Write a protein that binds this ligand. Structure first.
Ligand code: HEM
Ligand code: HEM
Ligand SMILES: Cc1cc(N)nc(CCc2cccc([C@@H](N)Cc3cc(C)cc(N)n3)c2)c1
Ligand SMILES: Cc1cc(N)nc(CCc2cccc([C@@H](N)Cc3cc(C)cc(N)n3)c2)c1
Ligand SMILES: C[C@H](O)[C@H](O)[C@H]1CNc2nc(N)[nH]c(=O)c2N1
Ligand SMILES: C[C@H](O)[C@H](O)[C@H]1CNc2nc(N)[nH]c(=O)c2N1
Ligand SMILES: [Zn+2]
Lengths: 411, 407
């Protein structure tokens, strides 16, 4: 079957056949759409089909489908599953798998970049100390003094579910949040619970507005351990505004490297529970969400005060006006310091070109509109007007529950 | 089967049970979400009538009463005899208000219960339709203090005698393609304008020409009528800080009035049912003015602001966008024509959602349409999970009649 998507601005129509390869479920049915719902130990049993399907894809991509090398590899994996109950990916397969999980990430606007991903194989890692070292090297390589390079580091896969490698931080680099006795929050309100765990584990909290959190690292199902990332490895950008000289005195800064560390990477039925990956920011992630969400740094009021906007009625659009100024400041600041960043116009335009290319060469591009459309200036970006089909392909990145909810403490 | 929706800003979790009463299909499956696609006989009719009357008599606390049973009986007899049936006035009013109540893409639903329903089921000609519509327009406009209304023409019979308003809204501006190659006026309305000209309309060929109505009665060929100019309230667009803004020559009309949809109540189909409320500012300022395929004015405004248009990263588009939207709200407010800003509308919808969950066990909502086309995440709807499902009575899209009309 064929499915059509139309762009309502250009009348361009595309035809999806890739959705036919989708196995995993969406959350939706014929009677309910769950498109705005944020969150909608395997047996050999299910494992060999998952392995086979993955290896068929891999061998197709390298133009060796049905070869002796292909057949031998299936055989080899089959026997390994039957006798050890799991199997090991070749380096080539791991790299291909990691690239494809990104390619398949329907909520990711940055996918034009998917084929340039540095894959760091950390499957020989055995301890939390070992994890720390790997992660420092990733941060340094990815940061590259401001000329950011995409990377992922892949720690050993799940075995029985009792020996998981996990990075407890949601992102490698994030600022602490402290709930005060008066109910106010100092620093990032999003990281309060994790900061408390760090403190509980013995972190000495400086208790400022922008304190880089320590890494909390679990190897082999053991209790996690604290490590401070070397500060000289943590590139940060002080935020200033090209015309508003008082903007610097708000005291804002952000880190340059966005690096997700709480997701689970699935390749050929294998589960990599610790697989931190990083790219570079789109300005709105910081300027719209991080700074302006009510539940985050929430700076809109202070910014609009300083601009002396009429704040007595929402219909003056003071929030909107201040929102634009903050986002200009972020882009200006990253640019002035030569730290890679992309604005939402350029990013969404690139995504549209990527998506059209994917339809032509691959037969589709699963995309989640709710996430792809930026959180400001929606309809002046080309993605707003683009129909999108959301479905789940493997390899994939999956959400997993926070480790402090599931971890069996050894003490 | 019982479903939670969470607000990620406030942590409020609501439980939806109303979706279980959903009847129509979504476009989605277990394998594919189509959340972003714009357009995804006697036997069938008695179930539809029963379902409706059951909810009606339930709503007036008379479920299972003799009056309930008697009406089921009466409607039942009428269908078997006549292959259709007629709504009581009370049922028509209830049905219309609920179609709006169930409109998952409408942010304005806190208002659903205050809808003036004009029963035009006695209308027989296109001249009658025209009279009904001017009365609706005058009533709704109310000298700028807008009031929600719907006018309901006779229901579908055998499908060859449909009442249809050919216009997509009661009030729209004409569009004309130039020898120049560009477009004068509203590019969205070019095809319809051609049909008007080809039906006989003498076009002024200006930038802001209110289109005539093209009214179809009883399946007959449609006819042209101009809405009295004095009933079409328009607003010149100025900016409270930029003196030059008015020089752009922009205006918009006060009355948003959708005329192309199909109202379905208890199996019955009202193919002509123009309805109207008042604008949310972004509809005009963001979509009408700034869509590339619409009036597309961002470039011109940004130049008058003398912004650095060299690189997308100066955010010149976003800057001019906010300003155009400030001008829309200011101009409507100054002329005392009802308008709502996206902040206030989305706040009211969150309150409405809470009421509906509390009072009805849910509220179907389409996040893709509810979240405003600018400043998404600074409105509370952005952080609000929504379940989208189809309830009846309902407003449905229907195909442009010129594609269907045999002359
Ligand atoms: C190259 C620069 C990149 C840019 C500009 C980019 C852009 C984005 C943005 C704006 C989001 C939404 C994030 C949010 O709203 O919090 C996102 C989500 C995502 N991105 Fe990308 N991205 C990039 C690289 C990557 C890389 C290298 C990977 C993995 C290898 C990746 C995988 C994802 C995944 C899995 C999500 C969804 C996250 C979630 O559900 O929380 N991204 N990206
Ligand atoms: C009271 C003032 C009202 C406001 C501020 C309001 C707000 C809106 C907005 C912003 C949209 C999105 C439309 C678009 O983006 O083009 C919408 C869609 C809708 N509204 Fe409301 N509305 C109001 C009154 C009504 C009334 C009185 C009805 C019916 C009686 C109604 C039924 C609908 C329907 C069916 C849609 C979707 C239209 C479509 O799918 O094309 N609206 N409304
Ligand atoms: C409940 C829940 C579920 C879910 N799936 N995600 C969340 C939080 C979403 C989130 C929060 C912070 C950073 C990012 C990165 N996606 C931010 C990021 C990462 C990369 C690699 C590049 C880039 N430009 N940006 C995503 C919450
Ligand atoms: C293909 C297609 C499908 C579909 N369902 N809708 C469209 C056009 C969408 C549209 C266009 C103009 C006006 C409105 C009114 N919905 C605008 C409106 C109406 C009312 C009553 C109040 C208000 N504030 N605003 C909606 C196209
Ligand atoms: C409830 C809703 O799905 C939630 O607020 C989503 C909406 N769209 C998003 N889009 C992006 N890119 N990131 C997000 O965190 C969200 N949050
Ligand atoms: C492709 C996408 O469905 C389309 O652009 C939608 C997105 N959201 C919308 N939301 C509203 N309110 N109105 C619209 O016309 C649209 N257009
Ligand atoms: Zn869906």
């Amino acid at each position: 079957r064929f499915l059509k998507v139309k762009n309502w601005e250009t009348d361009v129509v595309l035809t999806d056949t890739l959705h036919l390869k989708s196995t995993l479920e969406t959350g939706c049915t014929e009677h309910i759409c769950m498109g705005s719902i944020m969150l909608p130990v395997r047996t050999k049993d299910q494992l060999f089909p998952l392995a086979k399907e993955f290896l068929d894809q891999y061998y197709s991509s390298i133009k060796r489908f049905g070869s002796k090398a292909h057949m031998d590899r299936l055989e080899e994996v089959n026997k390994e599953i039957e006798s050890t109950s799991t199997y090991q990916l070749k380096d080539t397969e791991l790299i291909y798998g990691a690239k494809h999980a990104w390619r398949n990430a329907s909520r990711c606007v940055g996918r034009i970049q998917w084929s340039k991903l540095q894959v760091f194989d950390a499957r020989d890692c055995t301890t939390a100390h070992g994890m720390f070292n790997y992660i420092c090297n990733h941060v340094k390589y990815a940061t590259n003094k401001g000329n950011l390079r995409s990377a992922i580091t892949i720690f050993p896969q799940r075995t029985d579910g009792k020996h998981d490698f996990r990075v407890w931080n949601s992102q490698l680099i994030r600022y602490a949040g402290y709930k005060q006795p008066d109910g106010s929050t100092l620093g990032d309100p999003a990281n309060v619970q994790f900061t408390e765990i760090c403190i509980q584990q013995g972190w000495k909290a400086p208790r400022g507005r922008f304190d880089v959190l320590p890494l909390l690292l679990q190897a082999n199902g053991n209790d996690p351990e604290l490590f401070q990332i070397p500060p000289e490895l943590v590139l940060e950008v002080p935020i200033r505004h090209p015309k508003f000289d008082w903007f610097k005195d708000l005291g804002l800064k952000w880190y340059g490297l966005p690096a997700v560390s709480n997701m689970l990477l699935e390749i050929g039925g294998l589960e990599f529970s610790a697989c931190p990956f990083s790219g570079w920011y789109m300005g709105t992630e910081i300027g719209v969400r991080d700074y302006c969400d009510n539940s985050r740094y929430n700076i809109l009021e202070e910014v609009a005060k300083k601009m002396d906007l009429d704040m007595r009625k929402t219909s003056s659009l003071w929030k909107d006006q201040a929102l634009v100024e903050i986002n200009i400041a972020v882009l200006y600041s990253f640019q002035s310091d030569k730290v890679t960043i992309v604005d939402h116009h350029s990013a969404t335009e690139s995504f549209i070109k990527h998506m059209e290319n994917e339809y032509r060469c691959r037969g589709g591009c699963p995309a989640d509109w709710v996430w792809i459309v930026p959180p400001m200036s929606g309809s002046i970006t080309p993605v707003f007007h683009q129909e999108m089909l959301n479905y789940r392909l493997t390899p994939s990145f999956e959400y997993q529950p926070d480790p402090w909810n599931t971890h069996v403490w050894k003490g």
